[PDB]
């Protein structure tokens, strides 16, 4: 059984962001012998975030259910061309290669247009420096385009990087530590 | 007489990145008729910070302070390839021209030369989102060289930036909403 | 008398990049003391360009032209996500620090909104590698909206770019190491 | 039996970054069941390669031998803080979804370890412009390191990115299309 932990990073309350990462942890729950769990970073304690503080049990857990995950949907509302302050400072209180053997999907939501590529060039690389096995494509949605609630054309590319998402999880613990560069140093 | 802002945003405690932005906040002040802050993100109240409630007076007066400077010095350590998320969170409260008409000097310290990098791929677009009139080369320092305390070739190298951030500074207001895509929409 | 240069790299015959760089050109020398020139690199030898032979005259006449300029205009179109091989080729043969002391203004076209983030995540950091002393805001334009031929809030965008490139050269001998790690080691 | 397809991309004679991807062509080929090639980009005929002549027979079997590939190793010295021109002007001229269902593995050599994050931030974006499947962690080398004939440390590194490479290799008809935001619409 896989299990799968969304982390949403919007510090706005009713965030479209977080509706698209709860669709797209139920839509892989849905087709895969799966179990989750959705970490909205504005619910953890601001301080103890801020401080990495793991003696807040609440953290602690959070950071324990991600290291424990077969697959990562990180999601982020597009805040000055970039993912959030908010979503980064999750990210860094994660283990240095917290990410050896897991899947992932980038999903982002913003104003424009124009910023699709802050995915890609701005968090992508962030996956990365922790050893991540394999990063899907990115899903960006504009804020308009959202209301299962969209354009035909744009639910066909959400609900295929969701299914590759899905596709790329590992059921074998001989994947446990790729992506790491020295795997028997851990993961 | 200018007014010249340090933001730094290590979440640590005793940060050489605090140290390394108030040599040049100093060397800048003692070469130019300025006057200065430094605003440690640190110090700022964690829950107010991540949720950019600016009816907490010290989080108002650092964003007030950075939107009247005429030049900011930008400084993070690496975290994960990019800047913190502390530093991020900070930014991201700003107005979304918050920059228009400011020179900026991005530096940062690192454990590894290898994340060099990270300022102008990971920070410098996200200062660009923001309208910023003059962003100056980057500087990066490794953790070790760091003890006016390194190197005599990292040394020139720092004071050569610095240098050219304080001469990028603008003592007339014709150029005060240059950077800003719209100049008569504001700053 | 200011010298500026265009480089405009799109590989296409009838290129929309190329009349946008004219366009910024001709709008840079109409409103200062300046003369320029406009290097299409796709007129230059192809394997002259790609083993960086300058003993092709034309080649070397353009490295020189580039070595040379106050003020870049370095225009692309958007190929892959980022600046074309061609424009890149290019760039490759100049000197390690070919761009100290100048100004710079990045200017692309795309078939979609989506990529617009390709010049400061992609473009903006090469161009630092070369020492660059100040490169202004970044303007793309989506090609249909091409045609002083579109919209006016796009004018307006493209106009203040190329105002505030205008304004960013430097006629004083002080600037032209600027940007360089180390000015006295020349530039 | 899988086709790999190296392709190295310095304009420079004695290619120390060719003689990487050589390497880890081997390493993938003496452990799998594979047949492999080796695209020199410095080989394609040079106005052919920036004019996308596809009626250049040499060029025509480069591009169709990308397509056909199950993984593709992408090697680049570092110029100017990123992939060259040369490697690039070959990737322009692919299908807008040319690595559809394809693995893939960056490889670089630098002349200093202050570029690591090139591969990262500039190439890894490109190749997901391109549909790709999973591109595995990038590697890589400083010039000297190089002379199996580099530290441990480093052959570690090389060696683990291979073999993840090789894993990650697809032998299923199911995943030809995957990475591609439309499959339906070919890849
Ligand atoms: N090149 C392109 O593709 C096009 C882009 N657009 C963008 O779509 C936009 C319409 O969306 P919006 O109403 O703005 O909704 P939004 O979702 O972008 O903004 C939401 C809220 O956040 C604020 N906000 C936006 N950006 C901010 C920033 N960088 N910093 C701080 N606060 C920020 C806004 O003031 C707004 O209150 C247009 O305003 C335009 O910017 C529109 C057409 C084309
Ligand atoms: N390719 C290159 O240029 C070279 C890089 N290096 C790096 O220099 C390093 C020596 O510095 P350090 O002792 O590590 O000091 P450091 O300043 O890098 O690390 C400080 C602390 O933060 C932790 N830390 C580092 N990276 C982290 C991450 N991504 N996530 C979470 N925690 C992290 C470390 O465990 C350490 O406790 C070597 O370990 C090596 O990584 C060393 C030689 C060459
Ligand atoms: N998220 C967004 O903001 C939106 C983006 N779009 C984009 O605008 C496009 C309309 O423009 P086009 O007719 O495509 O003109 P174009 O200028 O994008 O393409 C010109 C030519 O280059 C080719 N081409 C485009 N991308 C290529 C690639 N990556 N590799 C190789 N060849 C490539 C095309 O086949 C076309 O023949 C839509 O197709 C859509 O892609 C449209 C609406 C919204
Ligand atoms: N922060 C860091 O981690 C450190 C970086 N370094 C770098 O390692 C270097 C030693 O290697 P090199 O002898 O330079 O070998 P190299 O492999 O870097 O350079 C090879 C050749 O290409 C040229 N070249 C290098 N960069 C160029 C550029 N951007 N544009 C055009 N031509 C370029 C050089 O002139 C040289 O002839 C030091 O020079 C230093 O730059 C050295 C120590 C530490
Ligand atoms: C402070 C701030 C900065 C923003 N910056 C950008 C931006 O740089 N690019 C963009 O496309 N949208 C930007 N936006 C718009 C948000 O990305 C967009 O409203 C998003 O859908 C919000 O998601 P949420 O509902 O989960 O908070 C910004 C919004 C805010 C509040
Ligand atoms: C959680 C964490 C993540 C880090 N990630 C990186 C990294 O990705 N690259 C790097 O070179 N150093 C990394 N470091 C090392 C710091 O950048 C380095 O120790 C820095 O000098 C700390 O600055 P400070 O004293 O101001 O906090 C990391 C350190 C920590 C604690
Ligand atoms: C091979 C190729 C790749 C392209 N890749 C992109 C792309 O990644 N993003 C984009 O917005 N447009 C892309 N385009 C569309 C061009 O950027 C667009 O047509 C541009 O305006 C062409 O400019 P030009 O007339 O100067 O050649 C691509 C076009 C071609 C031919
Ligand atoms: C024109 C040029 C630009 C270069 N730019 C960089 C650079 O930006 N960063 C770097 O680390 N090395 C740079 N180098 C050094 C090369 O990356 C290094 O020598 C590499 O190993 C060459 O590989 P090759 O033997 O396959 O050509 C550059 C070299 C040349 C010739």
Same mark, same amino acid.
């Given at each position: ?16 962001? =977080? &509706? %698209?990462? @709860?669709?797209?942890? !139920?839509?892989?729950? #849905?087709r895969?012998?799966?179990q989750?769990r959705? $970490?909205?970073?504005?619910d ?12 807040? =049990? &609440? %953290?602690? @857990?959070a950071?324990? !259910?991600?290291?424990? #995950? ?7 509302? $597009? ?24 899947? !992932?999907?980038?999903? #982002? ?40 609630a969209?354009?035909?054309?744009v ?33």
């Open positions: 059984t896989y299990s799968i932990v969304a982390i949403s990073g919007s510090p706005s309350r009713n965030s479209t962001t =977080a &509706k %698209l990462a @709860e669709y797209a942890l !139920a839509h892989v729950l #849905a895969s012998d799966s989750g959705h $970490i909205h970073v504005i953890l304690d601001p301080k103890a975030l801020l401080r990495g503080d793991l003696s807040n =049990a &609440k %953290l602690k @857990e950071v324990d !259910a991600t290291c424990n #995950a077969d697959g990562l949907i990180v999601a982020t509302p $597009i805040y000055k061309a970039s993912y959030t302050g908010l979503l980064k400072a999750f990210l860094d209180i994660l283990p240095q290669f917290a990410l050896a053997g897991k899947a !992932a999907l980038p999903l #982002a939501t913003g104003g424009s247009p124009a910023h699709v590529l802050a995915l890609d060039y701005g968090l992508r690389p962030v996956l990365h420096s922790m050893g991540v096995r394999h990063v899907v494509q990115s899903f960006f949605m504009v804020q308009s385009q959202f209301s299962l969209v354009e035909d054309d639910a066909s590319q959400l609900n295929n990087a969701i299914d590759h998402f899905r596709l790329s999880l590992s059921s074998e613990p001989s994947t446990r530590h790729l992506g790491h560069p020295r795997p028997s140093l851990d993961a």
